[PDB]
Design an enzyme around this catalytic site. Structure first.
Site, PDB file in Angstrom:
ATOM      1  N   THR C   1      21.789   8.863   4.218  1.00 27.92           N
ATOM      2  CA  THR C   1      21.536   9.747   5.356  1.00 27.92           C
ATOM      3  C   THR C   1      19.985   9.786   6.424  1.00 27.92           C
ATOM      4  OG1 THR C   1      22.578  11.850   3.812  1.00 27.92           O
ATOM      5  CG2 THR C   1      21.359  12.532   5.162  1.00 27.92           C
TER       6      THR C   1
HETATM    7  O1  LIG Z   1      19.328  12.664   0.830  1.00 28.26           O
HETATM    8  C1  LIG Z   1      18.751  12.986  -0.678  1.00 28.26           C
HETATM    9  N1  LIG Z   1      19.742  12.416  -1.713  1.00 28.26           N
HETATM   10  C2  LIG Z   1      19.923  11.422  -2.264  1.00 28.26           C
HETATM   11  C3  LIG Z   1      21.443  11.663  -2.776  1.00 28.26           C
HETATM   12  C4  LIG Z   1      21.373  11.389  -1.626  1.00 28.26           C
HETATM   13  C5  LIG Z   1      17.951  13.780  -0.958  1.00 28.26           C
HETATM   14  C6  LIG Z   1      17.544  15.186  -2.003  1.00 28.26           C
HETATM   15  C7  LIG Z   1      17.120  16.346  -2.229  1.00 28.26           C
HETATM   16  C8  LIG Z   1      15.574  16.184  -1.142  1.00 28.26           C
HETATM   17  C9  LIG Z   1      15.641  15.183  -0.184  1.00 28.26           C
HETATM   18  N2  LIG Z   1      14.787  15.335   0.217  1.00 28.26           N
HETATM   19  C10 LIG Z   1      14.381  14.068   0.899  1.00 28.26           C
HETATM   20  O2  LIG Z   1      14.924  12.581   1.397  1.00 28.26           O
HETATM   21  C11 LIG Z   1      13.048  14.240   1.986  1.00 28.26           C
HETATM   22  C12 LIG Z   1      12.351  12.800   1.721  1.00 28.26           C
HETATM   23  C13 LIG Z   1      10.920  13.230   3.066  1.00 28.26           C
HETATM   24  C14 LIG Z   1      10.223  13.807   3.111  1.00 28.26           C
HETATM   25  O3  LIG Z   1       9.571  13.956   3.361  1.00 28.26           O
HETATM   26  N3  LIG Z   1      11.110  15.910   2.225  1.00 28.26           N
HETATM   27  C15 LIG Z   1      10.800  16.216   3.381  1.00 28.26           C
HETATM   28  C16 LIG Z   1       9.950  16.817   2.199  1.00 28.26           C
HETATM   29  C17 LIG Z   1       8.664  17.817   2.709  1.00 28.26           C
HETATM   30  C18 LIG Z   1       7.725  18.358   1.805  1.00 28.26           C
HETATM   31  C19 LIG Z   1       8.474  17.919   0.414  1.00 28.26           C
HETATM   32  C20 LIG Z   1       8.801  17.137  -0.368  1.00 28.26           C
HETATM   33  C21 LIG Z   1      10.159  17.174   0.851  1.00 28.26           C
HETATM   34  N4  LIG Z   1      11.829  15.239   2.267  1.00 28.26           N
HETATM   35  C22 LIG Z   1      16.861  14.152  -0.351  1.00 28.26           C
END
Ligand SMILES: O=C(NC1CC1)c1cccc(NC(=O)c2ccc(=O)n(Cc3ccccc3)n2)c1
Lengths: 271, 234, 202, 229, 214, 232, 226, 229
Positions: C1
């Protein structure tokens, strides 16, 4: 069983709550209590019941925590009650826990007006929910907090409460009010308030002299703080003065009662 | 738990316990609300001023949140409960939604608590009407009323308590839209004096403008009572 | 994703791919990963698809009841806060959600990230998902507030494309939405492989 | 399953069910108590309905814990409720503080149970008064608890039927100097005043607080006191 | 002792313009053994126009199937007789899978039927309800064989050759026979037979089709 | 009457007036008839007939499962409660045993539910009568139920307003019903249902429901196409 | 106000709401029963109000276990409540104690249950007497539990409107000698004599037994013996 | 008035609190509803107690959902409760089945809350009309305090109802346009209202068959109706 429900929490036709009106009648039967809020402390003077010569003392080790009319709720909070004595003790215990829960949570004394709201919420409940009778009790609370200084509230069985400079509950409260109206002012010493409290109390229970046997007096005032244990928490600030609830022994009270005979003799000269 | 049914319909459609709560609100002290262009004015009768009540200022108009203020008529202690609930609701709301509670949302919550208590077994109704006034976080001012049935309604001006309807009939006649702060305070004082005796020590009056809530000092009020009692001769 | 969104002067762009991996086998090249909650609010799906689909749908329901109850649309801050309170309440129940909530309330455009633990952050730019590590490279370098709305969608589309190209879990169709004062528009869908041939035409 | 209150205020402010419970509690037989400098004595008539009652089995005076005792007037079985609770409280307190419950705390606990039955739903109040007598760090004590939940420390008193007259007669004979031999003598003399027929170690019970303990006199021990009156 | 068991086999559906075809193989497998070559439990009619297919644990699809069947009866009663649409049942199923989030049904479901416009549709689910509409579908043991083949013959994204006509329902059916047939050959947990259900507005044809028994 | 205010109060003659009063609710609902042939049961219910050009549906008749359904008279909201209950009990049963709940067991149940509401304070009798028609291995069944909790197994019956006349009618003809065909059962029901109409109102497709249930015939409320056939 | 709730004694220590429920039983259709050496027979006159009931309708006789049954007299719905409770007791005996419930036990349980509803302001007494007929390990047994919950064993018993007459007819029988075969005849015959015809025009007589011939199973008797 | 508990039947087979709740709905402001094939119309007398009231705030017509409206008569606060439940139920239906709730299903679920009284002390003193458009086209139902829904083609509730059921009997045909309906609505209100019918004194809304959306007439658009009459 529902045929026999007396429907204590219902309104009556004029939006009156009869059980609360009649609790008030029960309170106007009780021993008078006078409270006088100075700026050097607060005074409660109450009519004890007539002392049968076979009454004993409970011989409590702490003389200031309770008497017949006066109870301590916390270091900084005292009260006096009029009305159904046993109801008083239920509430008094509730007020004690509340004040100490506040201290548990915040580690500072509960303010008088919050203790008071808590108490009167507990009373209001019984006038609305629960199908039982209300607490048939009126407090005068007193105490001292850093927000407002010496305070003196009074509660009713409805759960309303009010702040006063002076007030009376119990027997001839209407009469005692009228007499405090005339003689209270904003700049009284403690001694002046103790006098006023006794002159009024002695005037409501129709005595030439004050009958030391039939009178209890409590005072809520600030005194030097002794047990500043400062090595034990170095950062903690300990105020120089701290509130003390004091119930007067018969001897500590003798002078103040003489001094109120003398201002009842010197008020029957002008006549 | 005791859950008898206290509030019930009588034969001719009426809920006596709610009619009697309302009777308890007609015995209560008057309160009045006026809505101007940029101001809400809440004014209430005080009971008098016996030399014995604490000369420290006790407010009879209550703050519910920063932006919202509530007067009431009826049972003091019931009111106090409603208000605490309202206070606690506005915080629950901030805490859930970050935003501050619109006034209308707060009013509806309160009115629902009132309604809920005309239908809960074990409980009588709150014998309380409320006037509630404030500004949303968009500079728009509001003024509401709840009665003990739980019915709320927004008003341009309103009265509750004793002789509510005398005062409301008065206000219908005079009241104009887009008053100024000072014309609001005037209009409210004028309206209250239709039923209160002097304007001396028996009127508290609160003025709400976007983000600023301010009680009249007893001095500022008296310039308005003379300015008004002098206009009542005519 | 891979999902991203950013605020610029013209609004908010949101862009996503469409692949759903079951680890190594590709379950779908066609997931819709922008949930149209209201019609002023979008949310993205990242993480556990069900978790996001379910709780975003709940949010949509809470948003709508707000509107019925109060006669006025919910603010973004509130919406995000609603979802954040849910994910917080369930922080111990292993939800997997990384979500953006974008919209334009009466306070203008607003963008939040809300995760499975109850975090709720409000920045001007975010990417989320396996491929975020890539999309930020392309995005961080091209992003400016003063982008037009073509330039902002171009930027958003390219960043997703670059994520898709490099990251095994991201792929399929790059969808771009814009969030402006009158709601949101779906700007475009493009297969990421058509986009390869458009951006690199040897 | 009845949850409405039975005790309620009446237009004069009185709680009539509690006056009636108080009436019930002065219809018992006489019990009385005498505090002395070195102990307390409580004593009751056990007026058995017939001779065919095993008078050993009638208990009008009761141990609540090693150091404290009670007797009662009015409705026996209501009092049995209070005594059971008071025994529990004495023991709960020891379990907590590993000391004996002071009489003052015990009576406040009793008082509280009485008060609950004046307010709680579904219940009528208790139709019995107690005397409670005991010894703690503050010395000897003797308390009366009424159905209002009110209580009084006394130096001497009497509840039940012959009680106004028994109180009057204790007012005369009571002295603050009194030792316990004289207290017992006075207690038994006071009972005997209003006693229809001979007093025996069968139809009377006596409890004393002495030293640090409460004990119900045996029939042996009581017979030695009843040979001197 | 696990509360979960994979009983294997494979479902596939393909939507058409006025039909959808749904297939499941009839083998029910145990541990290291075969319980029945004639299990019809994978495919379950919900309404005349909606079916569900389920792979995974036979026990949990029986439960699920009944739970849905009763939600559909409630819906009928609460909506003056009408049956919920395929899209409604599709969303309903997602919600029910998800309500068990915590102790999940071990089903990989499909809901298939006819949309309102009378067009075939398929929703596939994961175990907690992620779905989405698609024109085809296959869950189970052979999914990862069949699904790429259907990709290839339906979508033809790597063929220069212009896409042939819309597939009729006879041609679609052949296609699923060919692809079940190849799966039976190569997935050891699929075999025996395939029940096909051709859903149209005019009703549902059934058709059994033999696969190789080993 | 000091004894008619509470369901928990016997009268001194051994009556339970609140239950006799709940019965009044039923005697004052719209008429309904049922009849039972060899293989079929027919319910016919009078509805409420247009106020000029100005209709009004209420659901009297309810399907309950494939093999059973019911017609109510009296307090419709109690109907719905009972309908919800029966529906639910029939789904539990069919879930468990993969077959329909047998009618004698369902009648036992519906009667126990009623009894649960005539013995304690603050519950009250259902103010609704049911005809329950259904078909099982033992053949067709038709039960009437009443607020009192009684359940009658009938060959034919009617209830509701003016339904005494429906019962007069049914008493002449009911001995034949075991031989009648479905069309004559329906005729007989409609005839009986009509002996219960007010003065010069007559039966037609918009003041009359018909349900049938029976062998190889799930319980089926009749709509305006199939009903017309029978009503002429 | 002495008679509105069963939670209340009158000044003579009567409980009127129970006497009143009692009257419900006495104004009801008549039942009789006889306890022989080979089993128990119980019969009861069902009074229909309609000519159009099914035969079987409003059975007043219920099996409670293999070896026991309850014939209800009075409000049939109230009785089906008792029958349900009896059945739960019988099941309990089999499930927990792995024995058929003895009949004295069953009748005691039934009595306790009926009595409970005479003690509490919130419920009313049952308007039915249960006749319990058992033939478990305690032998043939016939009890009756009335609305007060009072339980008594009988050789023969009659309840309902013709009870006073039916008892006179039951006294003519020789209980030491009488067999379940004879009793089905006699008890049914009795219910035909005491039935009043110009009041209750429609009636069948339901009979049931538990006996050595029925393999000590409680069953309606075949309608050839009547 | 507490003589008879609330679950009690009258000798005519009516529950008393229900009959009384109904009596309260005849004290209410008149509301009415008209099914047409082009859409449904709801209209309500606002019956404000003062010119000082802000009339939008006394909203007798409420969006339940994009396609459903309700209009109460009787105790307004009671109606707020029902409509909140309808809103929640209608939205749970979308949530769960991803489609708009039928109007009947909605009315059911609003009556499902009105059965509950013994829980709720008393019935709601409220009748709703619930207009909507679903798959079966425009629909108008009425809830009562009984909990009994009833589909209608035209209806009134309130003080008006009897005078307004006169007028429907004469002028309502199953085949009128949405404008002839608006007109008949507003006519009826003119005739039965206490006050003079003005564009703020009433509330009118329609759910149109074509879009299936609900429009609340502003005061302007209600003048546009009064215009042609
Ligand atoms: O896709 C997920 N899990 C896998 C199973 C599919 C998955 C599942 C849960 C959360 C996420 N977050 C992120 O990836 C992500 C990565 C980079 C980034 O900048 N952010 C925004 C953010 C802003 C502030 C604080 C923390 C995060 N988010 C992904």
């Amino acid at each position: 069983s529902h045929r026999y429900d007396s429907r204590t929490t219902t309104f009556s036709p004029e939006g009156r709550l009869y059980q609360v009106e009649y609790a008030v009648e029960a309170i106007q039967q009780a021993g008078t209590v006078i409270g006088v809020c100075t700026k050097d402390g607060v005074v409660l003077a109450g009519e004890k019941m007539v002392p049968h010569p076979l009454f004993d003392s409970e011989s409590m080790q702490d003389k200031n925590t309770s008497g017949e009319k006066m109870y301590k709720i916390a270091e900084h909070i005292g009260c006096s009650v009029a009305g159904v004595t046993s109801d008083a003790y239920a509430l008094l215990n509730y007020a004690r826990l509340s004040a100490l829960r506040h201290q548990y949570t915040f580690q500072e004394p509960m303010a008088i007006e919050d203790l008071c709201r808590i108490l009167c919420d507990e009373k209001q409940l019984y006038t609305q929910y629960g199908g039982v009778r209300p607490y048939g009790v009126s407090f005068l609370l007193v105490g001292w907090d850093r927000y407002y200084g010496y305070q003196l509230y009074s509660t009713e069985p409805s759960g309303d409460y009010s702040a006063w400079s002076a007030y009376a509950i119990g027997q001839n409260d209407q009469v005692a009010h009228a007499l405090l109206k005339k003689d209270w002012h904003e700049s009284m010493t403690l001694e002046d308030g103790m006098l006023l409290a006794l002159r009024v109390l002695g005037k409501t229970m129709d005595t030439a002299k004050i009958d030391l046997d039939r009178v209890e007096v409590a005072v809520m005032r600030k005194v030097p703080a002794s047990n500043i244990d400062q090595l034990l928490d170095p950062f903690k600030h300990h105020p120089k003065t701290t509130p003390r609830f004091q119930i007067l022994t018969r001897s500590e009270l003798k002078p103040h009662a003489e001094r109120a005979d003398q201002a009842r003799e010197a008020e029957e000269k002008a006549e | 738990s005791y859950d008898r049914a206290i509030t019930v319909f009588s034969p001719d459609g009426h809920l006596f316990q709610v009619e009697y709560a309302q009777e308890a609100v007609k015995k209560g002290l008057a309160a009045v609300g006026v809505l101007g262009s940029d101001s809400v004015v809440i004014a209430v009768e005080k009971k008098s001023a016996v030399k014995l009540q604490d000369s420290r200022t006790i407010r009879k108009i209550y703050k519910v949140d920063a932006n919202i203020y509530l007067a009431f008529a009826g049972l003091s202690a019931d009111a106090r409960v409603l208000i605490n609930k309202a206070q606690l609701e506005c915080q629950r709301f901030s805490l859930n939604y970050e935003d501050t509670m619109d006034v209308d949302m707060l009013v509806r919550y309160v009115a629902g608590v009132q309604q809920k208590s005309t239908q809960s077994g074990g409980s009588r109704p709150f014998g309380v009407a409320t006037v509630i006034g404030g500004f949303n976080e968009d500079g728009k001012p509001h003024l509401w009323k709840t009665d003990p049935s739980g019915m709320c309604s927004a008003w341009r001006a309103v009265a509750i308590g004793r002789h509510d309807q005398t005062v409301i009939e008065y206000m219908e006649k005079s009241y104009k839209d887009g008053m100024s702060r000072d014309e609001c305070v005037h209009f409210a004082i004028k309206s209250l004096l239709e039923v209160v005796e002097s304007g001396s020590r028996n009127i508290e009056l609160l003025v709400l403008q976007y983000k600023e809530a301010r009680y009249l000092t007893e001095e500022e009020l008296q310039k308005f009572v003379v300015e008004v009692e002098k206009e009542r001769e005519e | 994703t891979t999902t991203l969104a950013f605020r610029f002067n013209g609004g908010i762009i949101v862009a996503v791919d469409s692949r759903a991996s079951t680890g190594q086998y590709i379950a779908s090249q066609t997931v819709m990963k922008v949930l149209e909650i209201n019609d002023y609010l979008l949310g993205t799906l990242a993480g556990g698809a069900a978790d996001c689909q379910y709780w975003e749908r709940v949010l949509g329901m809470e948003c709508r009841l707000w509107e019925l109850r109060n006669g006025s649309r919910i603010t973004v801050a509130a919406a995000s806060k609603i979802l954040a309170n849910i994910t917080y309440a369930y922080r111990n129940h292993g939800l997997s959600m990384g979500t953006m909530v974008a919209g334009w309330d009466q306070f203008g455009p607003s963008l939040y990230y809300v995760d499975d633990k109850g975090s709720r952050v409000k920045q001007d730019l975010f990417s989320v998902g396996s491929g975020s590590i890539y999309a930020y490279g392309v995005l961080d370098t091209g992003y400016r507030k003063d982008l037009s709305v073509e330039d902002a969608c171009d930027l958003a589309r390219r960043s997703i494309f670059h994520a898709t190209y490099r990251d095994g879990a991201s792929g399929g169709i790059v969808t771009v939405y814009h969030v402006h004062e009158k709601g949101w528009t779906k700007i475009s869908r493009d297969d990421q492989t058509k986009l390869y041939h458009r951006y690199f035409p040897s | 399953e009845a949850f409405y209150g039975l005790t309620t205020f009446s237009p004069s402010g009185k709680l009539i069910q509690i006056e009636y419970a108080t009436t019930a509690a002065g219809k018992g037989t006489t019990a009385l108590g005498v505090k002395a400098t070195d102990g307390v004595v409580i004593a009751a008539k056990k007026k058995a309905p017939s001779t065919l009652v095993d008078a050993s089995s009638i208990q009008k005076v009761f141990v609540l814990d090693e150091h404290v005792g009670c007797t009662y007037s009015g409705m026996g079985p209501d009092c049995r409720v209070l005594i059971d609770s008071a025994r529990k409280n004495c023991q709960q307190y020891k379990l907590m503080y590993n000391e004996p419950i002071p009489i003052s705390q015990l009576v406040r606990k009793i008082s509280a149970i009485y008060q609950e039955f004046t307010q709680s739903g579904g219940v009528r109040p208790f139709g019995c008064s107690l005397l409670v007598a005991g010894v703690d760090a503050n010395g000897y004590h003797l308390y009366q608890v009424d159905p209002s939940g009110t209580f009084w420390a006394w130096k001497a008193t009497a509840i039940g039927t012959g009680s106004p007259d028994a109180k009057a007669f204790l007012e005369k004979r009571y002295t603050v100097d009194m030792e316990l031999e004289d207290a017992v003598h006075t207690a038994l003399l006071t009972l005997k005043e209003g006693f229809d027929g001979q007093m025996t170690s069968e139809n009377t019970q006596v409890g004393r607080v002495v030293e640090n303990r409460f004990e119900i006199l045996s029939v042996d021990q009581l017979r030695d006191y009843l040979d001197q009156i | 002792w696990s509360p979960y068991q994979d009983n294997g086999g494979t479902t596939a559906a393909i939507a058409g313009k006025d039909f959808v075809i749904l297939a499941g193989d009839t083998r029910l497998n145990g541990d290291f053994c075969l319980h029945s070559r004639h299990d019809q439990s994978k495919i379950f009619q919900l309404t005349p126009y909606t079916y569900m297919a389920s792979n995974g644990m036979q026990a949990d699809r029986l439960q699920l199937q009944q739970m849905l069947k009763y939600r559909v009866k409630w819906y009928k009663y609460n909506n003056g007789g009408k049956v919920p649409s395929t899209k409604a049942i599709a969303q309903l199923m997602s919600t029910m899978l998800y309500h068990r989030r915590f102790f999940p049904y071990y089903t990989f479901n499909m809901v298939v039927g006819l949309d309102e416009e009378g067009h075939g549709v398929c929703y596939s689910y994961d175990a907690v309800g992620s779905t989405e509409p698609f024109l085809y579908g296959t869950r189970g043991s052979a999914a990862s064989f069949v699904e790429p083949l259907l990709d290839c013959l339906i979508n033809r994204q790597h063929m220069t050759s212009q896409a042939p006509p819309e597939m009729t329902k006879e041609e679609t059916l052949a296609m699923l026979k060919n692809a079940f047939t190849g799966a039976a050959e190569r997935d050891i947990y699929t075999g025996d037979s395939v029940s096909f259900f051709i859903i149209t507005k005019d009703g549902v044809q059934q058709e059994s089709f033999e696969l190789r028994k080993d | 009457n000091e004894y008619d205010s509470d369901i928990t109060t016997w009268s001194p003659t051994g009556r339970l007036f609140q239950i006799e009063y709940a019965n009044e609710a039923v005697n004052n609902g719209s008429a309904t008839v049922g009849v039972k042939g060899k293989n079929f049961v027919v319910l016919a219910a009078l509805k409420r007939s247009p106020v000029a050009e100005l209709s009004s549906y209420q659901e009297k008749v309810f399907e309950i499962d494939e093999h059973v359904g019911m017609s109510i008279s009296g307090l419709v909201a109690d109907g719905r409660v009972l309908a919800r209950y029966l529906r639910t009990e029939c789904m539990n049963y069919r879930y468990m045993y993969s077959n329909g709940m047998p009618m004698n067991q369902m009648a036992d149940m519906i009667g126990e539910k009623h009894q649960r509401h005539i013995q304690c304070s603050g519950k009250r009798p259902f103010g609704v009568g049911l005809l329950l028609a259904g078909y099982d291995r033992q053949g067709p069944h038709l039960y009437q139920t009443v607020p009192s909790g009684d359940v009658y197994d009938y060959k034919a019956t009617a209830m509701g307003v003016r339904s005494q006349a429906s019962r007069t009618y049914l008493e002449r003809h009911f001995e034949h019903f075991s031989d009648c065909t479905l069309d004559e059962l329906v005729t007989h029901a409609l005839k009986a249902l009509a002996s219960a109409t007010s003065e010069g109102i007559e039966l037609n497709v918009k003041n009359t429901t018909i349900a049938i249930v029976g062998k190889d015939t799930p319980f089926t409320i009749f709509e305006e196409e199939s009903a017309r056939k029978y009503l002429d | 106000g002495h008679d509105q709730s069963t939670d209340v004694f009158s000044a003579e220590g009567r409980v009127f709401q129970v006497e009143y429920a009692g009257k419900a039983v006495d104004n009801s259709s008549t039942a009789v029963a006889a306890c022989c050496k080979d089993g128990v027979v119980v019969a009861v006159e069902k009074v229909h109000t309609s000519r159009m009931l099914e035969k079987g309708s409003n059975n007043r006789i219920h099996a409670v276990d293999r070896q026991a049954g309850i014939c209800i007299c009075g409000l049939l719905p109230d009785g089906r409540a008792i029958v349900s409770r009896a059945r739960q007791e019988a099941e309990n005996s089999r499930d927990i104690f792995a024995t058929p419930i003895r009949g004295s036990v069953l009748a005691n349980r039934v009595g306790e249950f009926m009595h409970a509803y005479t003690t509490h302001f919130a419920y009313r007494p049952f308007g039915c007497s249960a006749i319990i007929a058992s033939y478990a390990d305690d032998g043939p047994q016939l009890f009756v539990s009335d609305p007060s919950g009072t339980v008594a064993g009988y050789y023969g018993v009659a309840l309902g409107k013709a009870k006073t007459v039916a008892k006179s007819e039951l006294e003519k029988l020789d209980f030491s000698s009488l067999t379940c075969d004879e009793a089905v005849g006699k008890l049914a015959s009795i219910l035909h004599e005491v039935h009043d015809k110009q009041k209750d025009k429609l009636y069948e007589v339901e009979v049931a037994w538990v006996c050595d011939k029925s393999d000590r199973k409680f069953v309606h008797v075949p309608a050839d013996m009547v | 008035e507490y003589d008879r508990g609330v679950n009690t039947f009258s000798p005519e087979g009516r529950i008393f609190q229900i009959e009384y709740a109904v009596e309260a709905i005849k004290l209410g402001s008149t509301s009415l509803g008209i099914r047409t094939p082009e859409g449904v119309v709801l209209a309500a007398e606002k019956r404000v107690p003062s010119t000082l009231v802000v009339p939008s705030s006394m909203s007798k017509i409420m969006e339940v959902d994009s396609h459903i409206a309700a209009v109460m008569s009787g105790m307004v606060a009671d109606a707020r409760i029902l409509v909140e439940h309808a809103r929640v139920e209608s939205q749970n239906h979308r949530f769960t089945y991803n489609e708009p709730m039928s109007v009947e299903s909605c009315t059911l679920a609003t009556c499902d809350l009105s059965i509950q009284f013994g829980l709720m002390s008393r019935p709601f003193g409220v009748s709703l009309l619930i207009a909507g458009v679903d798959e079966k086209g425009p629909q108008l139902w009425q809830t009562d305090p009984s909990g009994t829904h009833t589909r209608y083609d035209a209806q009134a509730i309130g003080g008006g109802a009897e005078a307004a059921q006169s007028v429907f009997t004469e002028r309502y045909h199953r085949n009128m346009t949405l404008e002839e309906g608006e007109t008949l609505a507003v006519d009826i209100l003119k005739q039965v209202m206490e006050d003079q019918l003005s564009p703020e004194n009433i509330e009118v809304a329609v759910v149109r068959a074509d879009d299936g959306k609900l429009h609340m007439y502003t005061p302007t658009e209600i003048k546009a109706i009064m215009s042609r009459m």
